Amino acid sequence: NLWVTVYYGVPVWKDAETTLFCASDAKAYETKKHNVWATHCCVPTDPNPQEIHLENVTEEFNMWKNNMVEQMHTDIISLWDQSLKPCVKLTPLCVTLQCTNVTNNITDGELKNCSFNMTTELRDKKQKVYSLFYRLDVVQINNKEYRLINCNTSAITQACPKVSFEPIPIHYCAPAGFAILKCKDKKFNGTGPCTNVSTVQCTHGIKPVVSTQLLLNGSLAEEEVIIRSENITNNAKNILVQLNESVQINCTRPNNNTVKSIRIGPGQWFYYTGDIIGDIRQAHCNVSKATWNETLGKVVKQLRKHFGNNTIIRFANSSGGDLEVTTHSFNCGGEFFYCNTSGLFNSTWISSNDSITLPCRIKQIINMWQRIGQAMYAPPIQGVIRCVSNITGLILTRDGGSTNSTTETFRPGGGDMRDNWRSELYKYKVVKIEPLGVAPTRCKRRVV
Amino acid sequence: NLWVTVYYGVPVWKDAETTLFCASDAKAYETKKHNVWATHCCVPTDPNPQEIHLENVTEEFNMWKNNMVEQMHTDIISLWDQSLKPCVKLTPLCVTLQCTNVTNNITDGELKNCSFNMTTELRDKKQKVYSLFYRLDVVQINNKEYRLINCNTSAITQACPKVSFEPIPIHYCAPAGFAILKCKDKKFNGTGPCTNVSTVQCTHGIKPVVSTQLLLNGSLAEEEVIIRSENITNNAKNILVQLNESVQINCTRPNNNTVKSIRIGPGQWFYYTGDIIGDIRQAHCNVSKATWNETLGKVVKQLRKHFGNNTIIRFANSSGGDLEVTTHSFNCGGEFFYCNTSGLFNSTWISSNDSITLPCRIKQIINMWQRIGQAMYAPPIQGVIRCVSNITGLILTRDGGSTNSTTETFRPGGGDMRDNWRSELYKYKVVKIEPLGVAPTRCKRRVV
Amino acid sequence: NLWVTVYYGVPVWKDAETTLFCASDAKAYETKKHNVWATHCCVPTDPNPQEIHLENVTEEFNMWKNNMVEQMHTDIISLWDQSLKPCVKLTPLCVTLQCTNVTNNITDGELKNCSFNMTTELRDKKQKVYSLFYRLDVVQINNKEYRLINCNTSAITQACPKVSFEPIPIHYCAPAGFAILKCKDKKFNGTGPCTNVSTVQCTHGIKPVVSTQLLLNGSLAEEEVIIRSENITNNAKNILVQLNESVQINCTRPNNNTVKSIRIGPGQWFYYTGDIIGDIRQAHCNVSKATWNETLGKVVKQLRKHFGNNTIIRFANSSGGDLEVTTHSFNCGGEFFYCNTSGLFNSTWISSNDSITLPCRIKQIINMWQRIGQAMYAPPIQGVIRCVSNITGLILTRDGGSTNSTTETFRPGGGDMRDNWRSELYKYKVVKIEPLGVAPTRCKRRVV
Amino acid sequence: LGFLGAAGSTMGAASMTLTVQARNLLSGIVQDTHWGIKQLQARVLAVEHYLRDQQLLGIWGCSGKLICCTNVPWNSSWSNRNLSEIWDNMTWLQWDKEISNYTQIIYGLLEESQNQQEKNEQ
Amino acid sequence: LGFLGAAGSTMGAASMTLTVQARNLLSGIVQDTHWGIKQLQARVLAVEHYLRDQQLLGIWGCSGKLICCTNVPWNSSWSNRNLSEIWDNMTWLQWDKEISNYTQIIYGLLEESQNQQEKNEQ
Amino acid sequence: LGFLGAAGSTMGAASMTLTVQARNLLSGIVQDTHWGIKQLQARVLAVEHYLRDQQLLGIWGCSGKLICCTNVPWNSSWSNRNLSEIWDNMTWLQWDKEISNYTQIIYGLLEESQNQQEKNEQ
Ligand SMILES: *[C@@H]1O[C@H](CO)[C@@H](O[C@@H]2O[C@H](CO)[C@@H](O[C@@H]3O[C@H](CO[C@H]4O[C@H](CO)[C@@H](O)[C@H](O)[C@@H]4O)[C@@H](O)[C@H](O[C@H]4O[C@H](CO)[C@@H](O)[C@H](O)[C@@H]4O)[C@@H]3O)[C@H](O)[C@H]2NC(C)=O)[C@H](O)[C@H]1NC(C)=O
Ligand SMILES: *[C@@H]1O[C@H](CO)[C@@H](O[C@@H]2O[C@H](CO)[C@@H](O[C@@H]3O[C@H](CO[C@H]4O[C@H](CO)[C@@H](O)[C@H](O)[C@@H]4O)[C@@H](O)[C@H](O[C@H]4O[C@H](CO)[C@@H](O)[C@H](O)[C@@H]4O)[C@@H]3O)[C@H](O)[C@H]2NC(C)=O)[C@H](O)[C@H]1NC(C)=O
Ligand SMILES: *[C@@H]1O[C@H](CO)[C@@H](O[C@@H]2O[C@H](CO)[C@@H](O[C@@H]3O[C@H](CO[C@H]4O[C@H](CO)[C@@H](O)[C@H](O)[C@@H]4O)[C@@H](O)[C@H](O[C@H]4O[C@H](CO)[C@@H](O)[C@H](O)[C@@H]4O)[C@@H]3O)[C@H](O)[C@H]2NC(C)=O)[C@H](O)[C@H]1NC(C)=O
Ligand SMILES: *[C@@H]1O[C@H](CO)[C@@H](O[C@@H]2O[C@H](CO)[C@@H](O)[C@H](O)[C@H]2NC(C)=O)[C@H](O)[C@H]1NC(C)=O
Ligand SMILES: *[C@@H]1O[C@H](CO)[C@@H](O[C@@H]2O[C@H](CO)[C@@H](O)[C@H](O)[C@H]2NC(C)=O)[C@H](O)[C@H]1NC(C)=O
Ligand SMILES: *[C@@H]1O[C@H](CO)[C@@H](O[C@@H]2O[C@H](CO)[C@@H](O)[C@H](O)[C@H]2NC(C)=O)[C@H](O)[C@H]1NC(C)=O
Ligand SMILES: *[C@@H]1O[C@H](CO)[C@@H](O)[C@H](O)[C@H]1NC(C)=O
Ligand SMILES: *[C@@H]1O[C@H](CO)[C@@H](O)[C@H](O)[C@H]1NC(C)=O
Ligand SMILES: *[C@@H]1O[C@H](CO)[C@@H](O)[C@H](O)[C@H]1NC(C)=O
Ligand SMILES: *[C@@H]1O[C@H](CO)[C@@H](O)[C@H](O)[C@H]1NC(C)=O
Ligand SMILES: *[C@@H]1O[C@H](CO)[C@@H](O)[C@H](O)[C@H]1NC(C)=O
């Protein structure tokens, strides 16, 4: 007595993977800021991004299988490489160097004073160039003989000095036929059902900040510190900790540099460090002590909800590996800092700022995203650099190998950039709209 | 008593911007002429381009806001750069040169006899190359020391000698969903209504001639000389003058050259000027005097319609700037001429040919479209070059700063290539077809 | 009394040209084999490629006008060039060489022992490199002076040593809207009607084997040897002979090489021949004599069906030209062999294996597809190479110039790679589906 | 009269050639290096426009017709012009300008009316 | 209620907004360097999905309707749920899951029924 | 019989599978480096062909049917073959060849007849 009735425009959906649009929200002018995040992502945002609450809709989310993470990862790497494509190559720098130690009021053999025969715009002429290098970029060959560290492995290019990499918020938007579901559950831990779901065509803006060990300038958790992981008991997985408060970090590169430049080919401008005005000081970052102490105490209180309130939680520094992994790596003013975070993790919890200072190292030859291949040369920045960042979260790992002593050890591990995007994208899922479907009705087609 | 009736296929349109197709009209064989204007633009034309007159249709045009100008500009630059992409680079020429003056029957230190150590196909061997250069391409470094002028700024590449840049007429065609409206009003001045409008799918063919100050080989006005500008009273705007007659210009490069070539790498053929057979003569262009005199007298008669018939109009030469702006620049037989047009503008109008000769300079290193960047090296052409061009128009500017003395001054200014395309494209506008619409009718849908 | 009735979804088609999809059939892992035929062609095949027999359908085929041949040709060349695009350039090898003869137990001045000043990762350092070359890759300049043969013509690049070019079967599949018709007539000679036709969405897999004169590893004819040509009587056309049996050929490069490598730039690894362990032996290929003799006897029996059974058929070797044409060229283990096939064609037919050995030459600098342009450098392979191939067919040409003596001469000519793809693709044709059409019916539309 | 031949005709007469324009919307059927990407984008865009208009005719119940009547009454606020001037003196170009601020109103009314009709048909 | 505003509504009520979703399938109408190729691919794909669904409605005889009845009877093996629960308590999201293994069955039946009807109409 | 299974069948019998071919025209739904641009072009082209044919069915008044009758009479100049041979002995492949010079004539007649019908329906 019932027949099939076909309905079109039915509000249902299925999990799907697709390509999202990149929108800038007009925070920068492509032609005035020359910001790589403004160019390419030139699509404007919706000035009135009306969100639609879905009443009585329950949906499941999984941040660890969320395809948006891969999409962000691929697009960032591509943007970066495209941005450096037209810049001056520095392969003429793979020459031997004659180097000595800096003749200044220095306390820590961090800086090398090197000279070399560099090319000029004419093939018949060479020029003597004198510059300072940080020791991490320069290695020995055998008034001593040195070469740049990248020369036995890959080509090195100069970042264009006119191009900014400063992140701006980026909004991702669904292509027509797709929609983005946002989970508003304040306690959402990255997986399972969420009963507070709304639909948007675009995500909020996320700044593509690269920061390895500590999550900087991200969003904050509301109400409580939230600890999320793929598997609580798997010591091979990272733990992403989102704070509900922020910690300010003051990072400085105090040496006042004079930046010099030469032509090394036909319009091929090369920038170098010149020399240092004043005395020599070590780069470093400052965190208020009380703030840091409370921050971890809160993290411990929450970790205990997974391991037991009768447990002991200790923090320790990096276990070992390359600086890109063991130190806190971030971009501050165009400069690349590698800070010694061991000063932050020397504490155990059991049942007038006095800021902690982390010494930092500086590198000019940068291998992005743990790739073996071309290196980027970061030109020096004229003057002195200072910035203040917000720690909004941490990446922790456990050693494992536990004998159930309850004395578990956590370290500032991880280092895989996908996790620093996952930490924001966890709120969103993308689905495909499936408008066609059927249901029984007490209706039959007129018979013909 | 009236209801909405929906009609589809309604013959209406709106102003729009889109991308046009490039059609060749088969004037050249891609594989026999190796003409850059034949390749890429390989779409054939309509052998029967039926035009449709629109009876009783009034439409407005604006040549100064016509998007087709930008489309032509972008496509020409791209074609040019793609065409040179696979050609031999001449960066090995940025070497010092030893130069003297030409040892010939020369009256005007125009030519430099230079020698240098050039590369060969093997890295272990160098060769001595002797060639002549025009002084405009060669500058001093400090038997005197010289370098090529581009070497402190940008890479230089050789135009492939096998590739022709000779313009052929190009037709632009609308993509489906769009149409081109052509204005036939004989007095159309570039803006406002036109009552004689027809629709075509393609424009007529326009030759993409590059000519700066004088408009060459374009179309002629009918009936009267037409003077068009964005703003008559704005001295910051150019005045485009379209003649209703033509002036023939005979341009010659009389020196008989022997062209030589060497390998400077693995199949990397380089061409150079060799030497000159016979005596040395200055490049120049000839215009009949009476013709030129009448040509400007007609222009003055028409300029007075905007400034007053009681005014005084004087012509003067270029105000200053680079040769690419101050001289008349054009491509004649592959060679690049920079002619001194001051000989054409030394006259004031108030209430047996005796041809005027304009001396010309020759350059081999060419910076197209006022860009700072890569330069094109124009290889020399074996023998002697002569061509005859049609002046079909002029670009004039006013000095302004007038005190209403009525003695207004006009100069052969401008130099922005977009204007030399605007001068032909002014007849066409592109619109989008909007086939769907409604109107009241005394008809109601059968009620169900 | 009849009216037009319109039918949609009508099973008819027309000859058409389109683009086909490349499917791998998962015979290799892109990431484990690094096979160029697995990457790019990553589309999976249909695990159940149901074929549809067309009952009572007669269709005409023409292998000589079959667009699939051109499609395969273009795609193979492109794949090859894309595959070599990221590899190390060897232009620093265009240096002079000092060479002597190999100091070993060699009987045939095939190998040259050369030394040269090669680049290093630093611009200030050079290194002495010693390597052996086959004489075909090295030419004289004037302890004797030599250069690589390609240096006066084009750039040379190194094939990436990690990349395999070993062919795997490739299936071509129609895009939606198109279908492929397969002819099953056992006697199909390449042209005219076929009454046994089925429709498939994909062709069977064809291995893209490059083999010039002899067709290797292809399919076999059933029942009889089939001789196909565009024109039997045109001596300017090739004759493709498909065997209904196979001949095994054992090809070896017996010299045991030690392969060495150096950096010649920043990660720019270069491979060279090092030296030879043991004595020196000539590369060669073995074919059983009886098998070869029967193979040609069968070919003759069939050739006589076109020329007369009272004729005399003789086989002769190549008429002349470059090794790429006159010898049998193939890829065996990554190595490039040029074998002297004259040993196979020294016989006339009229009304304990004792294998025939063909001496072979080896080349490292390879010009693919008779193009003038970049050469590929085939790195040497560590150890000793042996492979066994299946001759599945031959390319023969006639001398022509006949005086009707009946003593016709056939040679292993041709050499155009398109023919070695045509030899497999002849079974397939692609057509466009034309679903819309009309027919008379005794039906009129309800009148309104 | 050919494509847009009726552009200057009055609305009544112009309706006689509606098939002329309809057939020129998919004419693109006859018509890497960026030259290729630009042409491909143009083709995709033409398809999208065709479908957007066809979808609206679908939504309004006129998918199969060049001319269709609906159940939505005409508002004098859109136009109070004499019906005879609209069909005999006015052209479609003029008309589109005359009621240009109402297209989105009329379309919304058409969407609602058709949806109500289908609700009732079930 | 806006796009997908009815997603949590029961099936009966949800049908009141079918035009809301239909109009958001071709919204791409408002929306070389590989950034360009990716966007172009997305646009083409959206068109292909639209057409595939529209073709099925065509094949089943419902090309011009948001809601249409057919001649294919409902199987209790698909669902034996009370008709009133289906329209008043159940939502479309739940429903799709409930009968998800039958979509291809129902579609095959619709194709056959419509083809038979047309055969008989001739 | 499967796709084109009816290709050798006579016209009458062949009509029994019209849905088989119709569903294989948009099968592309299941199916920078120039490899990508070539595939994308193929997809766009398939869409354009689909729409061009669908538009004609629209124009002729047969948008929703696999089989439809019109008001245009059959010309003996196109074919004077016995109706029974046309449906029982002849195949569609043969038929297309038989009347191949008239497709554009028939289509023009269909366009005119449908436009006249709509004019009169208003
Ligand atoms: C977390 O977020 C904070 C901010 O919320 C980031 O810190 C900011 O970092 C940027 C870049 O390092 C700093 O901007 C720089 O400021 C320099 C000084 O500007 C002064 O004058 C302007 C005048 O209006 C004031 O607005 C400004 O506050 C200062 O008073 C500029 O000289 C720098 O310009 C450089 O880039 C431009 C780009 O085109 C070039 O043209 C210039 O020549 C030059 O190269 C730049 O503007 C900003 O001040 C910082 N904010 C604060 C509060 O310090 C953190 O870095 C971020 N954390 C992470 C990890 O990213
Ligand atoms: C305004 O328009 C005029 C023409 O209306 C242009 O002047 C023409 O310019 C072209 C190019 O500079 C000239 O063509 C050249 O002619 C040379 C001599 O050809 C003679 O023999 C042929 C045989 O059939 C005759 O047809 C011809 O009239 C002459 O008698 C050729 O040698 C040149 O060939 C070069 O290019 C080809 C391209 O592939 C190469 O293969 C050759 O090796 C060689 O490089 C060329 O054909 C043409 O003659 C000029 N016309 C006149 C009347 O002089 C103006 O230049 C144009 N104005 C502007 C500003 O562009
Ligand atoms: C006609 O078809 C025949 C086969 O039907 C082809 O001959 C084959 O050619 C391939 C390539 O030249 C040969 O494969 C090579 O074998 C070497 C030895 O492998 C031994 O051990 C494996 C272990 O499982 C056995 O399976 C195998 O049979 C042998 O016992 C390998 O070392 C070679 O590897 C190379 O390539 C890989 C690719 O990533 C690299 O990683 C390696 O480092 C190395 O470079 C390779 O596998 C194959 O054995 C041949 N078959 C026979 C029977 O000899 C003909 O060449 C073909 N004709 C033409 C003209 O193409
Ligand atoms: C790095 O080395 C350079 C080279 O010796 C030092 O520059 C020299 O400083 C002396 C000091 O009077 C001058 O007389 C020389 O002329 C300078 N050389 C040049 C090339 O200018 C430089 O000071 C050293 N820098 C540091 C920080 O040690
Ligand atoms: C440009 O300079 C070259 C180099 O000196 C001149 O060529 C020489 O001319 C003399 C004249 O007898 C010869 O003996 C030399 O052998 C020539 N040199 C070479 C390298 O061939 C050349 O004539 C000068 N050209 C001009 C125009 O001044
Ligand atoms: C190719 O030439 C090289 C260079 O002379 C030969 O290598 C030398 O062999 C002698 C033999 O005792 C050694 O003493 C030298 O030290 C070797 N030179 C180097 C650079 O190692 C090489 O043997 C020759 N190879 C052949 C096959 O003739
Ligand atoms: C700098 O001083 C340190 C002190 O131990 C020494 O090891 C190093 O070699 C010196 N480097 C140079 C370049 O003088
Ligand atoms: C340049 O090369 C010379 C070798 O001739 C060397 O002595 C000199 O130190 C080099 N210059 C520099 C600055 O290294
Ligand atoms: C050529 O002669 C002029 C004459 O003034 C002189 O200034 C110039 O330096 C000379 N140039 C060379 C290269 O001899
Ligand atoms: C090798 O020996 C042959 C023998 O004729 C001789 O011609 C050739 O020049 C020799 N080559 C070298 C490089 O010694
Ligand atoms: C390197 O160049 C020198 C010239 O200074 C030459 O004597 C030597 O033989 C070259 N080395 C080799 C291996 O050819």
Author numbering:
A (entry chain A), B (entry chain C), C (entry chain E): 33 to 140, 152 to 185, 188 to 309, 312 to 323, 323A, 324 to 397, 410 to 506
D (entry chain D), E (entry chain B), F (entry chain F): 520 to 550, 568 to 658
Task: Show passages lifted from the paper.
Protein constructs based on soluble ectodomains of HIV glycoprotein (Env) trimers are the basis of many current HIV vaccine platforms. Two-component, self-assembling nanoparticles are a versatile platform that can present HIV Env and other viral glycoproteins in a well-defined manner.. Here, we describe and comprehensively evaluate a library of de novo designed protein nanoparticles of different geometries for their ability to present trimeric Env antigens. We found three nanoparticle candidates that can stably incorporate model Env trimers on their surfaces while maintaining structure and antigenicity.
We selected a BG505-SOSIP trimer as the HIV Env model for initial optimization steps. The trimer was modified by incorporating the SOSIP.v5.2 and MD39 stabilizing mutations. A further modification involved knocking in glycosylation sites at positions N241 and N289 to occlude the immunodominant glycan hole that is present in the BG505 trimer but generally rare in other HIV strains. We used cryo-electron microscopy (cryo-EM) to obtain more detailed information on the structures of the BG505-SOSIP-T33_dn10 and -I53_dn5 nanoparticles and the Env trimers they display. Due to the flexible nature of the linker between the nanoparticle component and the BG505-SOSIP trimer, the initial 3D reconstructions of the complete nanoparticles generated only highly diffuse and poorly defined density for BG505-SOSIP. The data were therefore computationally segmented to reconstruct the nanoparticle core and the displayed trimer as two independent but flexibly linked entities (sub-particles). The nanoparticle-displayed BG505-SOSIP trimers were reconstructed using a localized reconstruction approach. The signal corresponding to the nanoparticle core was subtracted from the particle images and the trimer sub-particles were extracted and aligned independently. The final BG505-SOSIP trimer subset from the T33_dn10 nanoparticle dataset consisted of 84,435 sub-particles and was reconstructed to 4.14 Å resolution. A model of the displayed BG505-SOSIP was refined using a combination of Rosetta-relaxed and manual refinement in Coot.
